[PDB]
From a paper:
To provide an atomic-level understanding of neutralizing activity, the D12 antibody was crystallized as an Fab in complex with the England1 RBD. The D12 antibody forms direct contacts with the receptor-binding motif of the RBD, and the heavy-chain-interacting region overlaps with the contact region between MERS RBD and human DPP4 as defined in ref. The main interacting regions are in CDR H2, CDR H3 and CDR L2. RBD residues W535 and E536, which bind to the conserved glycan on DPP4, are bound by the CDR H2 and CDR H3 within the D12 paratope. Mutation of both residues abrogated the ability of D12 to bind and neutralize virus. Additional virus neutralization escape analysis demonstrated that another residue within the epitope was critical for D12 neutralization activity. The EMC strain of MERS-CoV escaped neutralization by D12 when the serine at position 532 was mutated to either a proline or tryptophan. Mutation to a bulky tryptophan side chain would cause a direct clash with the CDR L3, precluding the binding of D12. Binding studies also show that both D12 and F11 can bind to the RBD at the same time, suggesting the potential for additive neutralization effects.
Middle East respiratory syndrome coronavirus (MERS-CoV) has emerged as a highly fatal cause of severe acute respiratory infection. We developed an alternative vaccine regimen, based on full-length S DNA and a truncated S1 subunit glycoprotein, to elicit a broad repertoire of antibodies with diverse mechanisms of viral neutralization, and found that immunization with these constructs protected non-human primates (NHPs) from severe lung disease after intratracheal challenge with MERS-CoV.
Numbering used by the authors:
A (entry chain H): 1 to 52, 52A, 53 to 82, 82A, 82B, 82C, 83 to 99, 101 to 128, ...
B (entry chain L): 1 to 212
C (entry chain R): 381 to 588
The structure:
Amino acid sequence: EVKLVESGGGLVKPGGSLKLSCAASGFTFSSYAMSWVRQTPEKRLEWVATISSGGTYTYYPDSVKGRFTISRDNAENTLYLQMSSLRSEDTAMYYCVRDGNSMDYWGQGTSVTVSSAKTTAPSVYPLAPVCTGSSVTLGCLVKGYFPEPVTLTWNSGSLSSGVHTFPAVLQSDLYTLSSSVTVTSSTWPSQSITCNVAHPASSTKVDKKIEPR
Amino acid sequence: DIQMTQTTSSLSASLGDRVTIICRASQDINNYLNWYQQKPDGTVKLLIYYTSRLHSGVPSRFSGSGSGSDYSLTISNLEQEDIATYFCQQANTLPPTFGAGTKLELRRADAAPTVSIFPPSSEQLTSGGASVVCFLNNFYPKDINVKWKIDGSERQNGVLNSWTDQDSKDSTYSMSSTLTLTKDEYERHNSYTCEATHKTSTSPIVKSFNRN
Amino acid sequence: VECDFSPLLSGTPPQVYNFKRLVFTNCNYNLTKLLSLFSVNDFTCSQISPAAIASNCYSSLILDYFSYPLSMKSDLSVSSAGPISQFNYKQSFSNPTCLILATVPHNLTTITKPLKYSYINKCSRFLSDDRTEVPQLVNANQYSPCVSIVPSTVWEDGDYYRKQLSPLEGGGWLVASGSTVAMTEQLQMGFGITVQYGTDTNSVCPKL
Ligand SMILES: *[C@@H]1O[C@H](CO)[C@@H](O)[C@H](O)[C@H]1NC(C)=O
Ligand SMILES: *[C@@H]1O[C@H](CO)[C@@H](O)[C@H](O)[C@H]1NC(C)=O
């Protein structure tokens, strides 16, 4: 397998509007209820809206009611959430979910941010060890980017172990993130290691080869 | 609104242990209680529905029971890959309500952190910014203290810290602390050092570099 | 020392399938007390009389309350093959029972209306093959097996709810179908009373 893929998330100014989508597959869409559940910055989980298999009935928390509208298209096999009069409270991860007594399956989520702050492309800096060891640790630093999120991978996601990517830290309205990769001495520097960073909001793509300092 | 209280925020247990977590509710909920597990990468799966029922594809270490307003979740023979934050939800009335979560870490033999220190990129300096980055990696237990020394004098201000959730793969945390200064400020000093103090060692692990 | 009917009067009542059930032992009651509250609209007993049930001593007293619409009163009791008796609620043939249909007066703040009336039109278990369906008919005094897969309230009329059974359970599926009835101006409820007999205790006797 079943699958739920959310899309439409992004940065929107307070009072603004936005519409999320969720692509369903691997099960009969018409036959199950559907819900939107969002997780806040605190990691709080709060239900947002639920809709009947028919599309006939809808339900919303008082807090979100009348500003958010939940719709589904059975033929399309997608579930849409349309939001308006957004406030900073509304910022959360958003999950396509399949309902019933319990939420059967969840989408990976889409991140929605409501702020008057300005979108900012991250600045990406290679981290290279001081001028040793059998092994060696290298880093990518992503700085000054708003809003979340960025996806960072090494060698096009080819190399995934010895890899630690640390949670973004928000200071002064801008986010800072870093990742470390530890690899065998020989492998760097002889063979290229490249940091790959994407900021969708800023439409930023950058790959930085890590060259010896 | 029905308030769900997870009595405990975080737990420690060791592999093969049986631990039990309990949601408790504001009102009686007539048995309609679900459990969800969020992995560190942010993937949520439904462990259990209707208190005792067990979701397909979910193994039988996880068992649930309870009634009225107290229900509990049991995981047994814990495994590394069980590390996560577990939520309880209630579906009697609307709106569903959720718990705040219960964070499970597992216990592993203490491991010394691997410390790497990185100087500012020329690229960053070119832009007029200087950030010194320090990685402490693969260390248990989680509690650790990072002290930043400039020319032998501690600096507390301008230090930013991030800690990863317990690694499913080895049961070990890692963290990054960055000290940020302007290039001109950075160019006022010659030696920067990264100091880590851990349960494992009497004397702190240190990594430092000199501008040259 | 007095039987506590209070959970009935507080909160929002469950539907017929998941009816809240109270068991009383060692206490004294004034049934008159209960129905004083409500605009009763029907009140039938089997194996006992309405006057006798309130004036006798029992080992235990059992009270079921739930939201039930008067429109469906026919289906609820006895002979009717309507699913209600088939898949939702069945009373004991063997023991004396009473079935009370009542309406919540406007003066009763405390009880809360449900969004709507919900019930299970069909409950079935499908075999591993997924072709072979074994209808699950509730026993008296017992709860439909589909309470585990059906919601506090059906989301929508004609919804299907199904779950998959751990291979421990023999695999296959548990499948139910739900129906809804629009809420009345006043909440209409059903009460089910049954009593049990024991040697040691006849400790449930009328307050005087
Ligand atoms: C409301 O309660 C009062 C007090 O017993 C009762 O006299 C009256 O009949 C009730 N209203 C109705 C008709 O439900
Ligand atoms: C019964 O209930 C009434 C109120 O309906 C109350 O006045 C009386 O004390 C109770 N006792 C008996 C024996 O009826």
